[PDB]
């Protein structure tokens, strides 16, 4: 064979410790660039004027942050959605002041994680598998696109992307609630059902299989040694686990088809996380959560507050304090 | 009502900053992760045990044999992610452990908050910020948000206190 | 504010940036405040004020017509912000105005649909590949590919 | 930053002690 075919065979080799593949050919260089830039920025990057008002925010460890407060700070509002590669800056110092690393990181990262997903498809084809793992990963990937890409697009600025930090994440969460009442949005409510219920069914399935492990060991050893990698037999009694769980509720609330049971496990969290990614992506275009402010009034017309009116009071305090120097005009329209 | 509770915990207790809640977040999101990835993995390493395109009919609860391939699943994840489960008992014990331990950790944090024993602040950041008007981080930005929540929501949320806040005392940024 | 006698060109806002007017990163004159992010906007009611360096202070001082003021007030009060039950405005606004921009409705609906059609692409593309190679129904127990492959380690 | 000086020792021992525990157990497992 010729050199191109040698290379193609290596790329798509199912014998490499880590599969490379064609998606991997793009995934590796972009994730490496994003990772290296992130690590260096989180430790050393100087302060960043996130809001474009010459009010730089310090995000890095060497400038007086810790792990919890540190962040790679989103790029300046002055830039909005403009592309700001290193080579558009007059100097690296300018690029650092204006939040260039955030653009480099999120773009390489979104690109690499998209290829991560495609890479999951690709190896499943080389191994003879069914192909849909990558679809499960599309729920978290879509979520990432929503906070780093879609929400900046709708709001017109990367300075309202999610910060790459722990405290910055919370900042993003709080400002969001104030400007979109995300808690009153049903797609987010579906996301909470998605992850709560996913945690539930995670513990449920683990507990139920664990409960019906077949005795294969003694009391002085881990029961885990009762399962041998590759073994053809099953290691728990699903009939026993159905008989336990069927009685705990009723018989038909309980699965006895393993395939149906495990598809339910895939589908529940994935769907819910699709909805909450769609929830961010549509609040990006300012279709916000339900608004029942002053929805109840009495016979005279007095406002009878509800808990929605109490939430609104909290939202207002977030609204009036966030970016306290950035608004010159009375509405915060983006 | 519960949403108001959430926001109360943010503005008064700074609960997002609390490491016991952070462990609990990791356990719940981690549980959801495990739920989704285990269900998907099994559905996409099934053996062909019937001739139909709908693969659900090819499982019989009395059968002895694993319905999917642990061996092919392990290799896929080893090559995709670097490690994989190799022991089905550890796998399902870990699915119990992760979300159960997450919730337990968050409970401890709330027991702390009963006493207002918060992780509200970082002293070193407050000492510097107080001295250095040019020092800003996302930590100080979020405290201003908490301050906004408390003074704007308190009078109506705790009416028995008869809080009366003239407009002039309300913390507000420019314009808004 | 200009109508009240403000010199809108020399009004330093709180941050030191112009309260009404500032420069974009390439120098063009633009509206100040958070809207600095939207200075790429172009529209018929606004372009008459534009000169070669961006907004022109002589046109601002002299040439703003009533129809421009009307348009600007109309559009400000119809920004595409609103609640799912169609309460127009920011999330903290009280009920009164029954409004959601059709731009919001059209953008949100078609993102949702687009996203779900990417998922269906992945579903049916992955499936058509697996079907064409003949393992869309599962792995063959008697010829499991991985079993004939060398251990990774 | 005016941090806590016992922070260093607390972090160091927090890592060191449990980690050494596990290392001790793993090595003596391997040599039997």
């Amino acid at each position: 064979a010729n050199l191109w075919e040698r290379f193609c065979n290596w790329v798509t080799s199912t014998d490499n410790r880590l599969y490379v593949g064609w998606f991997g050919v793009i995934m590796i260089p972009t994730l490496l660039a994003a990772t290296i830039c992130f690590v260096i920025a989180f430790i050393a990057a100087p302060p960043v004027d996130i809001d474009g008002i010459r009010e730089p925010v310090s995000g890095s460890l060497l400038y007086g942050n810790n792990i919890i407060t540190g962040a790679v700070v989103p790029s300046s509002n002055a830039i909005g959605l403009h592309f700001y590669p290193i080579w558009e800056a007059a100097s690296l110092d300018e690029w650092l002041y204006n939040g260039g690393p955030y653009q480099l990181i999120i773009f390489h990262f979104l690109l690499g994680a998209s290829c991560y997903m495609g890479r999951q498809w690709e190896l499943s084809y080389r191994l003879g598998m069914r192909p849909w793992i990558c679809v499960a990963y599309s729920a978290p990937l879509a979520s990432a696109f929503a906070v780093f890409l879609i929400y900046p697009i709708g709001q017109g600025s990367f300075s309202d992307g999610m910060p790459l930090g722990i405290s910055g994440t919370f900042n993003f969460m709080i400002v969001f609630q104030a400007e979109h009442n995300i808690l009153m949005h049903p797609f987010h409510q579906l996301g909470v059902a998605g992850v709560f219920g996913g945690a539930l069914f995670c513990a449920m399935h683990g507990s139920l299989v664990t409960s019906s492990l077949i005795r294969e060991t003694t009391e002085t050893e881990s029961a885990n040694y009762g399962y041998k990698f590759g073994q053809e037999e099953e290691t728990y009694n699903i009939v026993a686990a159905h008989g336990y769980f069927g009685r705990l509720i009723f018989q038909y609330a309980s699965f006895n088809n393993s395939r149906s049971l495990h598809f339910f496990l895939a589908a529940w969290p994935v769907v819910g996380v699709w909805f909450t990614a769609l929830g961010i992506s549509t609040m990006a275009f300012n279709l916000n959560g339900f608004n029942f402010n002053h929805s109840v009034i009495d016979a005279k017309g007095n406002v009878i507050n509800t808990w929605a009116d109490i939430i609104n009071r909290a939202n207002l305090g977030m609204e009036v304090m966030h970016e306290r120097n950035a608004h010159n005009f009375p509405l915060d329209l983006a | 009502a519960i949403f108001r509770f959430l926001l109360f915990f943010q503005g008064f207790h700074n609960w997002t900053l609390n490491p016991f809640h952070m462990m609990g977040v990791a356990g719940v999101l981690g549980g959801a992760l495990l739920c989704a990835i285990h269900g998907a993995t099994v559905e996409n390493t099934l053996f062909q045990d019937g001739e139909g395109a709908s693969t659900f009919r090819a499982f019989n609860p009395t059968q002895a044999e694993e319905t999917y391939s642990m061996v092919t699943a392990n290799r896929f994840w080893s090559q995709i992610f670097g490690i994989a489960f190799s022991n089905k008992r550890w796998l399902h014990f870990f699915m119990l452990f992760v979300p159960v331990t997450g919730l337990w950790m968050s409970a401890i944090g709330v027991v702390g908050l009963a006493l207002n024993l918060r992780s509200y602040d970082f002293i070193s950041q407050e000492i510097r910020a107080a001295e250095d008007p040019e020092f800003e981080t996302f930590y100080t930005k979020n405290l201003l948000l908490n301050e906004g929540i408390r003074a704007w929501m308190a009078p109506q949320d705790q009416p028995h206190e008869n809080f009366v806040f003239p407009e002039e005392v309300l913390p507000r940024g420019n314009a808004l | 504010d200009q109508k009240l006698g403000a010199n809108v060109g020399s009004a330093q806002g709180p941050t030191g940036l112009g309260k009404y007017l500032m420069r974009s990163p390439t120098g063009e004159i633009i509206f100040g405040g958070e809207t600095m992010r939207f200075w790429d906007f172009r529209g018929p009611w606004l372009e008459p004020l534009r000169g070669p360096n961006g907004l022109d202070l002589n046109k601002i001082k002299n040439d703003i017509q009533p129809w421009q003021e009307r348009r600007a007030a109309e559009y400000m009060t119809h920004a595409p912000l609103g609640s799912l039950n169609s309460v127009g405005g920011v999330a903290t606004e009280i009920n009164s105005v029954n409004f959601v921009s059709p731009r919001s409705w059209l953008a949100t609906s078609h993102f949702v649909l687009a996203f779900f059609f990417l998922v269906g692409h992945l579903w049916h593309a992955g499936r058509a590949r697996a079907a064409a190679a003949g393992f869309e129904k599962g792995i063959d127990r008697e010829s499991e590919p991985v079993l004939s492959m060398p251990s990774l380690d | 930053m005016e941090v806590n000086q016992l922070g260093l020792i607390a972090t160091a021992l927090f890592v060191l002690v449990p980690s050494v525990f596990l290392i001790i157990l793993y090595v003596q497992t391997e040599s039997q």
Partner: peptide
Amino acid sequence: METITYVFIFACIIALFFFAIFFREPPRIT
């Protein structure tokens, strides 16, 4: 000192990734 401590722990974790992947106990088909 606190910067050095945060970075040291992060570095150790990246080292553990390497060993956990490349020097795992090899799963073998029994």
